[PDB]
Design a protein around this ligand. Sequence first.
Ligand SMILES: *[C@@H]1O[C@H](CO)[C@@H](O[C@@H]2O[C@H](CO)[C@@H](O[C@@H]3O[C@H](CO[C@H]4O[C@H](CO)[C@@H](O)[C@H](O[C@H]5O[C@H](CO)[C@@H](O)[C@H](O)[C@@H]5O)[C@@H]4O)[C@@H](O)[C@H](O[C@H]4O[C@H](CO)[C@@H](O)[C@H](O)[C@@H]4O)[C@@H]3O)[C@H](O)[C@H]2NC(C)=O)[C@H](O)[C@H]1NC(C)=O
Ligand SMILES: *[C@@H]1O[C@H](CO)[C@@H](O[C@@H]2O[C@H](CO)[C@@H](O[C@@H]3O[C@H](CO[C@H]4O[C@H](CO)[C@@H](O)[C@H](O)[C@@H]4O)[C@@H](O)[C@H](O)[C@@H]3O)[C@H](O)[C@H]2NC(C)=O)[C@H](O)[C@H]1NC(C)=O
Ligand SMILES: [Ca+2]
Ligand SMILES: [Ca+2]
Length: 364
Amino acid sequence: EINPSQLVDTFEENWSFYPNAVRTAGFCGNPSFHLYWPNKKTHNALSSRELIIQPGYMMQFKIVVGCEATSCGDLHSVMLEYTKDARSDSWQLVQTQCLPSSSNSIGCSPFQFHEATIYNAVNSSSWKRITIQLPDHVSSSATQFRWIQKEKQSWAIDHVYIGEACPKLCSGHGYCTTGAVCICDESFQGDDCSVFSHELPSYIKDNFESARVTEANWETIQGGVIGSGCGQLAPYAHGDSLYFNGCQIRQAATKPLDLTRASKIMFVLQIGSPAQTDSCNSDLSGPHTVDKAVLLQYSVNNGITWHVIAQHQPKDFTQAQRVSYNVPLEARMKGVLLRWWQPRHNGTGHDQWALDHVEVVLVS
Ligand SMILES: *[C@@H]1O[C@H](CO)[C@@H](O[C@@H]2O[C@H](CO)[C@@H](O[C@@H]3O[C@H](CO[C@H]4O[C@H](CO)[C@@H](O)[C@H](O[C@H]5O[C@H](CO)[C@@H](O)[C@H](O)[C@@H]5O)[C@@H]4O)[C@@H](O)[C@H](O[C@H]4O[C@H](CO)[C@@H](O)[C@H](O)[C@@H]4O)[C@@H]3O)[C@H](O)[C@H]2NC(C)=O)[C@H](O)[C@H]1NC(C)=O
Ligand SMILES: *[C@@H]1O[C@H](CO)[C@@H](O[C@@H]2O[C@H](CO)[C@@H](O[C@@H]3O[C@H](CO[C@H]4O[C@H](CO)[C@@H](O)[C@H](O)[C@@H]4O)[C@@H](O)[C@H](O)[C@@H]3O)[C@H](O)[C@H]2NC(C)=O)[C@H](O)[C@H]1NC(C)=O
Ligand SMILES: [Ca+2]
Ligand SMILES: [Ca+2]
């Protein structure tokens, strides 16, 4: 007598309206059946049925926006929204931006900084799997979600799951299926898919003096290259730094590490320059200075949630400094990710930063 409480579709009555959508396969590296919107007179979108949803539900899907495109273009954002009565066209984003500058609103928790649920060619140029512990304001007796792109960019969706949160959201190494059970990815096991079958590195060392060691050490490096834009990083460091001048997302996130024996995280950081050069500058007058800080974060779920170890405001790092932090107990586990990230910035030529002497002591 009530609407369904789950929706699983790897690709009939699950989906309400899907303008311009086409059910195909083999787009941009996905061999499975998925639905695609081509680049080819309406807002193309994909909506769902009305769903009863309760606090503690999750949403997980696979998405592409612009296959193999250069990121610096704003292009056409795919927004993931929710609604509670379709008759009134009251649609709101599933997750809103939660930055250090923003107040703690409905979506935003104190220090759990995340992004919004809009997806662009910058982010999903490759098939990415997004997992969200959806906020409690989404829950209702008949909630509908939709992906809308309000001359267009292609985009695609596959393996959608909306329903009860299964243990630990499958730990970011597995997918949730019918009945709130977790089917793990390759080489991961357990009821929550947290246990890695193989072993992981004990500690990471990187002075960025050889491109091969850095290519082995890091999983994602976005918006920055091995260079010397802010100069030789410090009195504390030398040579080529990881220097972030690139447009859009500026990020350096390690491969999975084993931090059970990790003691402290040390590095040398600079944000801007005393010279305030075009290669390396910082806006200390703007009110959004907190968003232009370099956040050090850790993740135990392979990227679903990041927790702050330290924040580095640009006012305190005009001259590069060496810093050391204790690895929190919650982060002293197997399969931990470390990340250096700039939340906001003004594109190339603005708000640059450099990183060097990445050292995990991991020793008595
Ligand atoms: C980096 O990137 C950011 C974003 O693009 C730049 O920030 C922009 O700076 C310019 C100034 O160079 C701002 O223009 C001014 O806007 C005010 C009115 O602002 C009000 O209304 C805006 C929408 O209409 C709104 O965005 C504003 O809110 C911003 O600022 C408040 C705090 O002030 C903050 O709470 C918000 O979150 C936003 O950050 C605000 O509500 C206007 O009065 C100004 O006009 C004067 O100056 C111009 C010439 O400069 C002149 O022609 C006018 O007659 C008048 O004298 C001016 O237009 C712009 O709003 C900013 N945008 C954002 C999104 O913040 C930043 O400058 C870039 N560079 C650097 C180095 O940081
Ligand atoms: C990559 O993925 C990101 C998320 O994973 C995508 O992020 C979103 O990108 C769009 C731009 O394409 C941004 O949209 C703008 O955001 C501002 C902020 O809204 C403010 O409004 C109220 C005013 O009352 C204020 O209180 C809020 O705190 C906000 O500050 C909007 O006003 C604009 O209309 C516009 O929507 C998103 O902000 C941004 N999300 C995040 C988390 O930053 C992103 O698009 C993808 N691609 C790229 C290139 O980054
Ligand atoms: Ca599929
Ligand atoms: Ca170096």
